[PDB]
Amino acid sequence: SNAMEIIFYHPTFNAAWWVNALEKALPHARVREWKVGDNNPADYALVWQPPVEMLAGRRLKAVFVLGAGVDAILSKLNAHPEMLDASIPLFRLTGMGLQMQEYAVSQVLHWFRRFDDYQALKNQALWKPLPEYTREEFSVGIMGAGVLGAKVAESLQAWGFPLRCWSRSRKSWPGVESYVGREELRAFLNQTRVLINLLPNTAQTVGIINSELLDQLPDGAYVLNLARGVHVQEADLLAALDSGKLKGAMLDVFSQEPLPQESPLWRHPRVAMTPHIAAVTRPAEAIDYISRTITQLEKGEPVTGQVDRA
Amino acid sequence: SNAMEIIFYHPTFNAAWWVNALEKALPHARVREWKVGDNNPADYALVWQPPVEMLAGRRLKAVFVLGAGVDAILSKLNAHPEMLDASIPLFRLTGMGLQMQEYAVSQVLHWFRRFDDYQALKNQALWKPLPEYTREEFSVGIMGAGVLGAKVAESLQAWGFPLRCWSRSRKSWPGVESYVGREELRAFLNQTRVLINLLPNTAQTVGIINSELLDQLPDGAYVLNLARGVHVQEADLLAALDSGKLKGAMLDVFSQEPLPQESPLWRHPRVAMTPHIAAVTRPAEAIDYISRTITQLEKGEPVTGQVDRA
């Protein structure tokens, strides 16, 4: 023919910027942003929250999901077996431990040094040095196995906080007490001052952070949600913040995103919020991965990052 | 006689708690909180902002200043040569690098990840992922030589920020570009996104952070003041925050402390404030130092932490 055709679709990224970087990364490719009504052939598709008509009936060499988190797309494909011929390989971008570390280390220290309290004191123009928290009473509990959790634990134990992790599978991270299964969840929660959620999702963790879990945390605890919005029952979180069970929370993810303006979370004085930016893959990195993987496919070499479509 | 008499005075600490810990640390000592009119002998005096009548005419084996920062007391003694017989040794408690590190690392990351911006966006109930800052453009500049500055630099370069330091004396900290003298101050400021002040004081640094210095920082910079209040010209800081020269500031120290409620700093939305708590010596540590040093003096052994009364 024989030009390589690539199509690109993202709900909120700058298509122009991505099309460009892609053109320079794969100079021998024709890249174009996909728009409704575009049924001209393509060899590779780069997508996030793609509509059905973009991929339905397409013959493609591969689809690249623009982000980690294949749960959303897999369910659209599984609820629409007709959206992507099941023989087409699907890929995902996780090398973002650093980003998580930055976020968690900043906030855990922020809370440890009572900057949240000091900000409230500032807003009342009240000079009041507060009692200091001991490292011993400031235990960190990470929920979730996987590199992100492992990286976050590593970076926090370096500051001397007691660390514990909880997962369904038994684990052995250096300098961390490992708790396993719903059987050991209470023991884990009882001893955790700062609860950090880094669970990849599961049917078995939906709404896991609800009142039944919050009740086992010691009073004056904190919740840092870096995993999935559906892991937190928002009404229960707010109730725990209002009763004093929780001193504070920081949430990067929400049950519904963008979080509707109507949500009271926006309004709570002891909730901090970030619009799902804890760890985004740098486009340069994303582009390097995608171009590298396309090259391996064109040459029949081994690839990495393929998502099994169980 | 022969009981060892110790007297204690602090303007805001819990005298009872300190007297107690002291009694247990030196069981063989009689410790008492000093109150106006108490002219009964003592062997050692533990003080912070002592009034003249507490130390005038006293024969003492040593005075212990309850904190690092001997500038305040030395000037009261030097302006009142009659407050402490000049033959009496004076001691000070610096092993607080960790505390500074916690503070600086938390805040520099806080700013780097735009949590300040995200908080403002939260307060407007506006979901808006913001552009990310590169590490390259997020250079840290530490003013001041000495361990605290060295510790803070060490902990920040570990996160991959470009680091520079400025002092009057030439220095060589690993992984840090060293700038020396007022001659190289502009070059240093021009390249510094986050200015961290850790200068021990000098006549030559009073009001150093004024408009002439702020003007050399790149727009969108930040100031973190962890050293002395008199180092910052508060009116100029506020002006720099209002013009956009400075995106934000965090201050742990102020020209006058407690900062009068009248000060506009309390009121600025892009100033964060803490009541001089960046690095306080743990009382347990303070007590261990003082008891250890008293024991060395009683036994004629070498001591450490003595302040020359030049």
Curated annotation (Swiss-Prot), chains A, B:
EC number: 1.1.1.79, 1.1.1.81
Keywords: Cytoplasm, NAD, NADP, Oxidoreductase
GO MF, any single term: hydroxypyruvate reductase (NADPH) activity
Catalytically driven reaction(s): glycolate + NADP(+) = glyoxylate + NADPH + H(+); (R)-glycerate + NAD(+) = 3-hydroxypyruvate + NADH + H(+); (R)-glycerate + NADP(+) = 3-hydroxypyruvate + NADPH + H(+)
Naturally occurring in which organism (per UniProt): Salmonella typhimurium (strain LT2 / SGSC1412 / ATCC 700720)
Leader peptide range in chain numbering: none
One Pfam family recorded for the sequence: 2-Hacid_dh_C
Entry keyword annotation includes Oxidoreductase: yes
Name by which UniProt lists this protein: Glyoxylate/hydroxypyruvate reductase A
One term under GO cellular component: cytosol
Protein family per UniProt: Belongs to the D-isomer specific 2-hydroxyacid dehydrogenase family. GhrA subfamily.
Function field: Catalyzes the NADPH-dependent reduction of glyoxylate and hydroxypyruvate into glycolate and glycerate, respectively.
Active-site residue list: 228, 276 (proton donor)
S-S pairs: none
